[PDB]
Symmetry: D2
Subunit: 68 residues, 4 copies
Amino acid sequence: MSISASEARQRLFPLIEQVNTDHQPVRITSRAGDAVLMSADDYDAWQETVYLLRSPENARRLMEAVAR
Amino acid sequence: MSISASEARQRLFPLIEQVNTDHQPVRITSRAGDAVLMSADDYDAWQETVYLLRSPENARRLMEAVARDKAGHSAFTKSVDELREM
Amino acid sequence: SISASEARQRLFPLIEQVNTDHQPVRITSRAGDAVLMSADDYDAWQETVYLLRSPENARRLMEAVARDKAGHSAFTKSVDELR
Amino acid sequence: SISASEARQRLFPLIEQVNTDHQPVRITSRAGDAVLMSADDYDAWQETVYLLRSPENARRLMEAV
């Protein structure tokens, strides 16, 4: 799962299945710059958690509630 | 709040009570420079959380665990709700 | 956001786009949903929170980014003053 | 870490250390535990986290030249 763009183009569909089951990023290569394909749920989860880390109480809340 | 080093020297027990009740940091101001007093549990919880965030997959797992139970839900919702206010 | 059919068609232009404006693209499909972002945003996100494990590293990152913008010329000047 | 009664005796040198060393100090006490850190370092930490919300800002943190 570090591949050329032209191959990522043909395999796009299984690559979407993979990213949703694996939850690892796929590094895509090109003359145009590299891209990462990742699952929407991993992306959302990461952006949401970094937003919540704005408030240091929030991590304590989250940690405390898990361990319940 | 924000107070001088000279009064914080006097009021250290009550500022630590405050910091671990209201969870708002206290700026202590002085000739040298200024400092911030906060709750240690807030501080450590933050660090350890960031330690676990090695990759987006870890963020997803942490969101799962929050999704597991009623305790996770309300903690999460409350945090979202504060964030909606500010 | 765009479908996977279309993302498959336009992948090459989407790869250059995502590295030009640096905005991620949401891709929906019957197989599931993905996002496509530049490898640079992705690495920068991961690395930057990893650095932030110690909150003290935030000041250090700001100082490094400022040294970066200032240039090699600011450092040569320091060298010269030290002599 | 240090007790709150040691920290009271030495609050000035402590505020100076924390600004010079750019490392926090843990304070343990009867009223619970607290962390003392440089105000500027606290502010940079809060600001950086705020910023990290976009993957664009993160990119500009990494590729700042």
